């Protein structure tokens, strides 16, 4: 189906504790495959998927050089933003960037993005047209006009439509088998006490990958939307994910409820109940 190549960049100023920290993380689909961190010494662009080790010394050297080049640029950018916001040289500030392309099954661009934030808030973003900009405040407007005047959007459109898309093809080539991996959930229901004549049924899904999953509870064939409790899906720490969803039901009526688990990995959805 569709695919994406995205780079997540963070630059963080640290006045009096050292040089700004520059971090760059690349994702294919939603899987980290490269990373650069300016805080190692002899910082290097590094593979984060074994399948990227197919690339060879020239790739890695050129990406390292380019990342150190961005690091320098971002140092300047941070200083500029102090001016725009009349901010002192003593505080820590953050620039963040999300840059990338979504392509279809045919390999053609579906959408490109290049979004900036400052101190965690939208600053400037390239519009879907890949031609115009949305500035979030007055400071961003200064950047918008500088970027319009400099043809930055033309540059980005060319990168997004071509370069980015072509590199996505290449990486998919070496990672597609590993990327397609899927671990189905294993699920079970636990039983816990509530005050008076009520109990909690908790449906657990464990060991699954990728993270996208749905858990639902049904009374008799009919969904308990109004109020089931759940947790945000969370990493087990070993590459797989966890989720649960619970409902409070009458003591004695536990067998009136079923939990359903929906995941890509499953031949069909799981249906469970309390033992």
């Amino acid at each position: 189906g569709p695919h994406s190549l995205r780079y997540f960049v963070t630059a963080v100023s640290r006045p009096g504790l050292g040089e700004p920290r520059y971090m760059e993380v690349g994702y294919v689909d939603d899987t980290e495959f490269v990373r650069f961190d300016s805080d190692a010494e002899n910082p290097r662009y590094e593979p984060r998927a074994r399948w990227m080790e197919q690339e060879g010394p020239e790739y890695w050297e050129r990406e390292t050089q380019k990342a150190k080049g961005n690091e320098q640029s971002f140092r300047v950018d941070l200083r500029t933003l102090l001016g725009y916001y009349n901010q002192s040289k003593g505080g820590s500030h953050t620039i963040q960037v999300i840059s990338g392309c979504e392509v279809g099954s045919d390999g053609r661009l579906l959408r490109g993005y290049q979004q900036y934030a400052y101190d965690g808030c939208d600053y400037i973003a390239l519009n879907e047209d890949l031609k115009t900009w949305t500035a979030a405040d007055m400071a961003a407007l200064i950047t918008k006009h500088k970027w319009e005047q400099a043809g930055e959007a033309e540059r980005l459109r060319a990168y997004l439509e071509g370069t980015c898309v072509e590199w996505l093809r290449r990486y998919l080539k070496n990672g597609n088998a590993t990327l397609l991996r899927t671990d189905s959930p294993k699920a079970h229901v636990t039983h816990h006490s509530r005050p008076e004549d009520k109990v909690t049924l908790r449906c657990w899904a464990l060991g699954f990958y990728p993270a996208d999953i749905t858990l639902t509870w049904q009374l008799n064939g009919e969904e308990l939307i109004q109020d089931m409790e759940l947790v945000e899906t969370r990493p087990a720490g070993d590459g797989t994910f966890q989720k649960w969803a619970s409902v409070v039901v009458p003591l004695g009526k536990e067998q009136y409820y079923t939990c359903h688990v929906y995941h890509q990995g499953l031949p069909e959805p799981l249906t469970l109940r309390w033992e």
Partner: peptide, 9 residues
């Protein structure tokens, strides 16, 4: 391979 912005903020 990531884009390298050649103009400042």
């Amino acid at each position: 391979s990531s884009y390298r912005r050649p103009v400042g903020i």
